Amino acid sequence: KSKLPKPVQDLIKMIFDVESMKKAMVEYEIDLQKMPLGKLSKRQIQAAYSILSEVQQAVSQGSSDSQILDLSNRFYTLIPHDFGMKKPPLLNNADSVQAKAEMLDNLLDIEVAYSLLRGGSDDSSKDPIDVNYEKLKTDIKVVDRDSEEAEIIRKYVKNTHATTHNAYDLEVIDIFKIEREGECQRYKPFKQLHNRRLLWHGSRTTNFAGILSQGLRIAPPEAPVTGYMFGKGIYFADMVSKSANYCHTSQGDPIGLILLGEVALGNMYELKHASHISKLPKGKHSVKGLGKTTPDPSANISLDGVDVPLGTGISSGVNDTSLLYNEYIVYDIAQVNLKYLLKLKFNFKT
Numbered sequence: 374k375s376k377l378p379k380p381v382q383d384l385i386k387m388i389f390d391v392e393s394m395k396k397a398m399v400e401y402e403i404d405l406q407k408m409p410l411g412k413l414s415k416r417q418i419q420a421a422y423s424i425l426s427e428v429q430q431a432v433s434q435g436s437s438d439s440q441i442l443d444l445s446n447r448f449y450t451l452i453p454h455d456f457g458m459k460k461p462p463l464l465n466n467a468d469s470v471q472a473k474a475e476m477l478d479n480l481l482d483i484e485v486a487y488s489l490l491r492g493g494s495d496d497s498s499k500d501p502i503d504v505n506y507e508k509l510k511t512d513i514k515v516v517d518r519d520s521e522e523a524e525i526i527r528k529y530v531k532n533t534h535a536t537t538h539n540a541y542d543l544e545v546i547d548i549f550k551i552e553r554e555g556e557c558q559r560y561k562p563f564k565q566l567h568n569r570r571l572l573w574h575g576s577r578t579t580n581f582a583g584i585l586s587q588g589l590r591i592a593p594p595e596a597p598v599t600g601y602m603f604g605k606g607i608y609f610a611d612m613v614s615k616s617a618n619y620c621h622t623s624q625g626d627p628i629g630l631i632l633l634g635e636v637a638l639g640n641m642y643e644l645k646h647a648s649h650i651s652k653l654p655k656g657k658h659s660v661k662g663l664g665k666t667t668p669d670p671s672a673n674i675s676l677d678g679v680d681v682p683l684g685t686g687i688s689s690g691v692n693d694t695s696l697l698y699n700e701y702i703v704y705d706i707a708q709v710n711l712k713y714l715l716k717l718k719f720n721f722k723t
């Protein structure tokens with residue numbers, strides 16, 4: 374039996390759950406008989422990303438719906454969808470491109486989780502929880518409830534929950550201090566860079582085995598840049614509820630996982646509307662999506678020399694913007710240093 378803490382053990386079980394991976398694929402209307410978990414490959418997802426990038430071209434250049442039909446069908450050939458003997462819905466718009474790009478982002482993380490679980494070594498004498506924990510190459514420790522860092526994190530959760538996200542309230546079950554192998558060494562060029570903030574990153578439970586082993590990555594070159602609001606980068610939020618929406622929890626699965634990462638933002642490229650950029654303008658290290666609401670800047674605190682915007686939501690004074698809340702995007706994976714992993718219970722009030 375495993376000597377790991379019970380919350381650490383429950384975390385491993387949750388992220389390496391094969392049925393949850395299958396459930397996530399079903400959600401994206403994938404045909405599991407034509408394409409099960411085992412048949413998924415980095416190559417197939419990449420080829421589908423490229424076919425989606427072709428759909429991105431047809432939509433923008435106002436191509437005929439009879440020319441988009443073959444591009445749409447090609448995507449379904451690479452990624453089989455559950456429609457049986459019926460014709461599948463037409464991928465002829467930017468929304469369909471975005472939705473299928475999000476699916477492929479998840480499939481790429483699900484593939485990493487499954488390859489980890491099916492690769493390596495099988496040993497009956499060792500606890501399967503301990504074996505799977507080692508595969509993540511991440512030091513996971515339980516943060517003591519009565520510690521100052523736990524009080525800071527709980528205040529951050531409590532204060533940055535938005536009114537427009539009141540269909541549920543949030544309960545912090547566990548706070549994990551995480552240390553990805555080699556990540557501190559990778560973050561070294563940006564360790565002293567100004568504007569370093571502790572920000573939120575919400576994702577589906579089925580993506581965390583991929584996130585903890587490989588780190589938060591950027592969508593591949595094959596991915597359609599127009600399917601990403603501020604281009605292919607790593608997205609963060611200063612509001613817990615904005616990130617918590619990306620946990621994709623329901624009444625049937627109310628437990629989610631959220632990250633707290635130290636992001637070296639530096640000189641921010643402040644944007645109000647969609648900008649599908651491949652590269653940042655000279656002298657800029659990040660993009661700040663200007664939201665209508667911002668945490669109180671006077672209420673900012675410093676946890677290990679890192680700014681924690683745990684202030685309650687106040688008006689930013691930003692007019693004519695497509696965002697209700699701020700977002701932060703970095704375009705170099707070395708600019709992120711993951712600090713905490715939170716297990717949350719979503720108490721749906723609907």
Ligand SMILES: O=C(c1cc(Cc2n[nH]c(=O)c3ccccc23)ccc1F)N1CCN(C(=O)C2CC2)CC1
Nearest residue numbers: 478481574575590591592607608609610616619700
């Ligand atoms: O951060 C994002 C991302 C997230 C989102 C949604 C989102 N998800 N989670 C958040 O906490 C968040 C905060 C503010 C704004 C958006 C978000 C949209 C586009 C994105 F490129 N990534 C895209 C998916 N990722 C990948 O590694 C894909 C598999 C190759 C991780 C990085």
